[PDB]
Amino acid sequence: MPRKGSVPKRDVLPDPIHNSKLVTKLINKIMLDGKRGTAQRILYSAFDLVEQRSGRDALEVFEEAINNIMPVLEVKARRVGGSNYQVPVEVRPERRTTLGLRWLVNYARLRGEKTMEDRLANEILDAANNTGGAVKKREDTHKMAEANKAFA
Amino acid sequence: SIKKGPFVDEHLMKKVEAQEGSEKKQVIKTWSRRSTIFPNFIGHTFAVYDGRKHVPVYVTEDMVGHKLGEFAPTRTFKGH
């Protein structure tokens, strides 16, 4: 479910090591039941591979990715019914796609095993300078609705 | 639902010295599957009891190492 509607959602909290919640929501993808016994180690064998393969830490070269994931500016429209009616729109952190955590670039875990131990280290570093790769964090949430001109 | 008491009949085992040494009857008021099976149950007859009547099912010489409990066919399953 109208008469009623829909209102914003929840989010996450940083960590005392780097003061970053970008690592936190990624652990919350895997935060087993409070028993993060080596889900901690799986996170620290996923998130470190952008700070390691790319020399700079979570705030400079990882910022090339984590300036662009859950939003300040995303694609969205208003109450216009069943038409196209598309324009670019500024947004808040309520419903989320282009500054901190959301959709495409960064499937850490999508290579040729059925593992979590080493698979997260496999497909991780593709969000070095925000260049695609595989579906976890951003890329494809920027290029939606700018097509038809003549026979539109 | 217990595994106690390897039980030959204990009242009809008194008669099984004459019904397994000899053969047991074919269609009589019997059950023909509880009393355990062993390779000394060879060449005898017995009557399995569903309720229609005690239909003969034999107790042959290959009867050594199997067990019982559809001692009357509870389903006659066919159904669908």
Binding site: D15, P16, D33, G34, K35, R36, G37, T38, A39, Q40, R41 | -
Partner: protein, 127 residues
């Protein structure tokens, strides 16, 4: 405190025997790095714990009780919480809002069957 000072959270009692001096890992005097290889639940409570510098002011010496294994620990922080008003009043500015001053944030919110929280409908029959 040499009495039943308020060290108690998430199924924990504490006889916080406040011996002046060492504030260390006095949860049965062990470590948590690969014993809790999760390694996430101990040092995160630094805003209440470490701010007053009760690492060379007072011990906790907690007497522990309650909570299945994934439930009990982290209660030495509340053992030193009511100590902090008598161990080190160095960071009493933030404990009125949240810290060692009043109470504990999270604890055993006893199992409410048929709901989890706040408008959910997770992947049961619904979403």
């Amino acid at each position: 405190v040499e009495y039943r000072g308020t060290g108690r959270r998430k199924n924990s009692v504490a006889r916080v025997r406040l011996v002046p001096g060492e504030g260390n890992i006095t949860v049965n005097n062990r470590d948590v790095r690969e014993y809790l290889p999760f390694e996430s639940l101990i040092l995160d409570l630094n805003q209440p714990f470490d701010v007053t510098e009760t690492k060379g002011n007072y011990d906790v010496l907690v007497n522990v009780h309650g909570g299945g294994f994934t439930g009990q620990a982290q209660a030495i922080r509340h053992g030193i919480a009511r100590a902090l008003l008598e161990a080190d009043p160095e960071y009493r500015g933030s404990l009125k809002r949240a810290g060692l001053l009043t109470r504990d944030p999270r604890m055993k919110e006893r199992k409410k069957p048929g709901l989890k929280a706040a408008r959910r409908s997770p992947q049961f029959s619904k979403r």
